[PDB]
Every structure is written in C-alpha cells, then in structure tokens.
C-alpha cells in the first residue's frame, strides 16, 4: 500500500531528506511513501494540470499563496479533521491558520507544513571594511541606500574571488521571488499588491504609494548598486552568486542558515568565505510601515486520491510535533506548528533568532482564487520594470504605464485564468 507526494526543493537533497523524514511513518504503517520533487518554476503548471486532469499525487506541497487558488477549483479534500487532531486553530499562529483555506471558505483544504519569511543576508567582512553599521543600514530606506553607496565605493575584495562584491544582488526574472522581493518596498511605502474596491479585488500596483515603493527599489539598480547581470537572473542564480562571494547583500529565507552549515557535496556552501562571514538583518522600515514577506508551504490532499485515510495519517504525522522539528532542522525552515518554535534547537541559533523575531513585521497576500495567475503576471511585469533599468529607460512615467498594464492583466487574472 502506497502514497505519492509531490514536494518542492526545500532541503539540499530534497527526495533523500524527505524519505529520511517519513522512514519512521513507513515502518509504523508498513507503507511506501513515494516522493517526486518539482522545481518552484514548474510547480504551478504541474499542480494546476493535476487539478484540471483529475490525475496526480495523493499529497502535494502547496505554497501558502496558492492554497486559495487550488482550493477554488474544488479538487482538495477537506482536512478540518487532521487540523483538529493536531490541536485545532489554537495550535497555529493566526497568519498560518489563514493559509489553511481560501479566504471566506467554511472548510480547511491545507495542513500547515513549514513557515518562512524574508530578511537580508549580508557579508559581515564586507560591511565592516566599507564602514557600514548593519543595524543603521537595515533600519530605514535612507540607511539602506546610504549603506549600498558605501559598499559600492568600498575597495574590499572577496579573499577567494580577489574581485569587488556587488552591493546588492536581486533576481530580475523568472522566480515568484521577483514579486516577494518587491512586496516589502511596496508595503513599506503604504502600497499593496491588491485591494478590495466595492466587493471586488483589484491590482493596487499602480497606486501612488505602490509606485513610490517599487520605484525606490528599482532605482537601486539604476544607481549601480545592483549589477545589470543580476536583472536577467532568477533566485537560484542570485543565491549561487552570494555563496560564490560576488554580492555583499541579498534577501532570502531562513533555509540559507542551514545551507551555510553543510558542505557543497550535500548541497550547502560551508566551505565558502560567505558562510564564515554571514550576518542577517530584517527589512528596513519604509515611510508608512515595516514589512517583510511571510509565507511557507502547506500539504493538500487531492479529492481524487484512492488512499484518503492513509494520506490523512501522513498529514497528521508531517504536521505533528516530531516531524515538524525534524523537517525544520533538515530544511532550515520554521515549523508551521506554533509550539515547535519554542524547541531549544531553534532558540539557540543566533541568525535564526533574527528571523523568528522579524516575524513581527511578516505580511502575506490575501488567499484569493486568482492568485497563481496574479503571481505569474506580477513576475512577468516586474521582470519588464527591471528591463527598463537594464535599458536606461526607467522614469516615473514609464513605470506608471507598465504597472497600469500589469494592473489590467492582474484584474483579468482575479476574475478568471
């Protein structure tokens, strides 16, 4: 008797780590859990195709921002019973509890698996040589720009590369992170990705404060703090650039702390200079508030599964205290189950404590039926904003026109695919 699970690359050896996580469940129940790893860039295509075709795994990993969109298609088995078995609404942060369902829905369609939120990694060696105080650089937008300017002027060279470091690396194309990396600047300026306007969600990417935030962020590339090359790269490539010692600063989740402690052979970067000179700081406060992206992933059961009782036992296992701590140790993500955040393993990790204590500023998108389509279009149009910088064509007016077109396309996507 057999289960199929789809996962995304959450750990350095994703399939191997997942098989080690579930080995105790397989021995307790005498069942094989098969796992298939889907890269984040293809995960939306494969999960939507399973949903429309009626053919797929028993369980899939679902990014928190996609839970509503797949739930709206009527293909997910309700999992209120599993959530109750794990201690109900009180066993979770309210933010995590909202990701268990499409907004407004009666029944939970996803079990919280892990949480993640964004902050700035920085080269402790690079900022000290530039004379940049991290606490000041990451406190405000003025501090953040002032720090990048000192990093740009610095004569510091990576000991291994013997070359200067880009002050800031950020992916300009492909990745969902093109949206998640823009969102804190939009939010900090008092903007948002979407707003409710008389019963209906619509794009707010072209609101005055959304344009102010987005323009500040884009203007960092325009000022030469982000290298032109970075504007054509995706998250994986920017990550690799940081590990290789080529960027002083970059935004990521808590998984990089875990990657920093594991050799290249096992998918980490423990051998690199960047791993030995690693700091973390939260997103700076904008003029209207202080925000970072908060998300993570849940687990969802397809209602066409031929193994629903067994699949629910797997959900209860993976969502429960033991598996929560073990998978968070293997991945460097945060447990989704509130109680596991206290575990000593997490408490005593200095860089991880910075992530945990930055949760205070965590914000996520509303859980809407349109949302996978919104992320695809957002990533495409923000990709074109980064192009305006690459081309030396970034003005207030060209960004406004571009986000008007993004907003028209997003409004379509909130209505239908």
Ligand X SMILES: OC[C@@H]1O[C@H](O)[C@H](O)[C@H](O)[C@@H]1O[C@@H]1O[C@H](CO)[C@@H](O[C@@H]2O[C@H](CO)[C@@H](O)[C@H](O)[C@H]2O)[C@H](O)[C@H]1O
Ligand Y SMILES: OC[C@H]1O[C@@H](O[C@H]2[C@H](O)[C@@H](O)[C@H](O[C@H]3[C@H](O)[C@@H](O)[C@@H](O)O[C@@H]3CO)O[C@@H]2CO)[C@H](O)[C@@H](O)[C@@H]1O
Q: Under rule CB under 5 A, which residues in 37-56 are in contact with Na ion?
A: 46, 49
- Residue 113 in the binding site for ligand X (CB under 6 A): no
Q: Tokens 């969502």 label which residue? A: 319
Q: How many beta carbons lie within 10 A of that of residue 226, not counting itself?
A: 26
Stretch that binds Na ion, among 11-19, 280-288, 292-300, 343-351 (CB under 5 A): 11-19
> Does residue number 244 form part of the binding site for ligand Y (CB under 6 A)?
no
Is residue 17 involved in binding ligand X (CB under 6 A)?
Answer: no
Biggest CA pair distance of the chain:
63
Query: What is the closest distance, in whole angstroms, from the C-beta atom of residue 310 to ligand X in the complex?
Result: 26
Binding-site size for ligand Y (CB under 6 A) equals: 21
In angstroms, the CA 18 to CA 5 distance is 10
Residue from 193, 311, 336, 340 binding Cl ion (CB under 5 A): 193
Q: Which stretch binds ligand Y (CB under 6 A): 57-65, 103-111, 307-315, 338-346?
A: 57-65
Residues 3-62 that bind Cl ion (CB under 5 A): 13, 15-16
Using rule CB under 5 A, residue 16 touches Na ion? yes
Of 248 and 336, CB closest to ligand Y: 336
Give dist(CA 165, CA 151) in Å, integer. 8
Q: Using the minimum distance from each CB to ligand Y, give the nearer residue, 63 or 282.
A: 63
Residue closer to ligand Y, measured from CB, 325 or 334: 334
Q: Which residue is nearest to Na ion (CB)?
A: 49
Contacting residues for 126 by C-beta, under 8 A, at least 6 apart: 151, 154, 156, 165, 248, 277
Q: How many CB atoms lie within 10 A of CB 29?
A: 16
Return the sign of the alpha-carbon dihedral for residues 167, 122, 38, 301.
negative
Phi/psi for 334 (5° steps) reads: -95, 145
Which partner in Na ion, Cl ion, ligand Y, none is near 175 (CB below 5 to 8 A by kind)? ligand Y
Q: Does 270 bind Na ion (CB under 5 A)?
A: no
Q: Which residue lies nearer to Cl ion by CB, 85 or 95?
A: 95
Minimum separation from the CB atom of position 263 to ligand Y (A): 14
Q: Give the closest residue to 75 by CA, choosing from 299, 306, 305.
A: 305
Q: Which residues contact 336 (CB under 8 A, 6 or more apart)?
A: 92, 96, 112, 113, 114, 115, 296, 298, 319, 324
| Phi, psi angle pair for 401, to nearest 5° | -55, -45
Residue 127: CB atoms within 10 A of its CB come to 25
Contacts of 129 (CB under 8 A, 6+ apart): 154, 155, 156
127 and 147 Cβ atoms separated by less than 8 Å? yes
In whole angstroms, how close is the CB of 247 to Cl ion at the nearest point? 27
**CB-nearer residue toward ligand Y: 143 or 172:** 172
CB of 152 to its own copies, least distance (A): 20
Q: What residue ranges bind Na ion (CB under 5 A)?
A: 13, 15-16, 46, 49, 243-244
Q: What residue ranges bind ligand Y (CB under 6 A)?
A: 9-10, 40, 63-66, 116, 175-177, 235-236, 239, 253, 255, 259, 295-297, 375
């Amino acid at each position: 008797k057999t289960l199929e699970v789809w996962i995304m690359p959450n750990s350095p050896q994703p399939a191997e780590d997942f098989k080690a996580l579930v080995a105790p469940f397989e021995k307790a129940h005498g069942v094989e859990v098969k796992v298939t790893v889907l890269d984040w860039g293809v995960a939306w295509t494969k999960i939507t195709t399973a949903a429309t075709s009626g053919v797929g795994p028993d369980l899939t990993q679902l990014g928190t921002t996609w839970v509503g969109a797949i739930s709206a298609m009527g293909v997910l088995e309700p999992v209120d019973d599993v959530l109750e078995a794990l201690g109900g609404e009180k066993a979770y942060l309210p933010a995590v509890w909202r990701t268990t369902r499409l907004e407004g829905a009666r029944q939970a369609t996803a079990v919280p698996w892990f949480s993640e939120l964004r902050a700035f990694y920085y080269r402790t060696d690079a900022l000290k040589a530039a004379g940049v105080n991290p606490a000041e650089m990451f406190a405000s937008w003025q501090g953040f720009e002032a720090g990048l300017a000192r990093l740009k002027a610095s004569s510091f060279r990576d000991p291994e590369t013997k070359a200067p470091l880009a002050p800031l690396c950020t992916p300009g194309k492909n990745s969902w992170d093109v949206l998640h990396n823009a969102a804190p600047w939009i939010w900090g300026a008092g903007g948002e990705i979407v707003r409710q306007a008389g019963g209906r969600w619509q794009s707010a990417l072209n609101s005055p404060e959304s344009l102010e935030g987005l323009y500040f962020f884009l203007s960092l590339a325009q000022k030469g703090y982000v290298p032109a090359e970075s504007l054509e790269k995706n998250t994986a490539q920017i990550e690799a650039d940081f590990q290789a010692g080529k960027c002083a600063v970059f935004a990521s989740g808590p998984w990089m702390i875990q990657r920093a402690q594991v050799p290249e052979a096992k998918g980490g970067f423990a051998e690199r200079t960047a791993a030995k000179n690693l700091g973390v700081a939260p997103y700076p406060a904008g003029p209207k508030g202080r925000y970072t992206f908060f998300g993570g992933s849940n687990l969802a059961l397809f209602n066409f599964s031929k193994n629903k009782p067994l699949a629910k036992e797997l959900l209860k296992y993976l969502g429960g205290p033991e598996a929560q701590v073990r998978y968070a140790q293997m991945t460097g993500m945060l447990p989704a189950l509130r109680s596991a955040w206290s575990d000593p393993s997490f408490q005593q990790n200095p860089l991880l404590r910075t992530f945990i204590q930055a949760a205070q500023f965590g914000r996520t998108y509303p859980s809407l039926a349109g949302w996978g389509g919104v992320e695809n279009l957002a990533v495409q149009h923000l990709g074109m904003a980064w192009d305006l910088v690459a081309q030396g064509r970034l003005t207030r007016e060209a960004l406004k026109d571009l986000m008007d077109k993004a907003s028209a396309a997003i409004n379509q996507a909130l209505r239908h695919h």
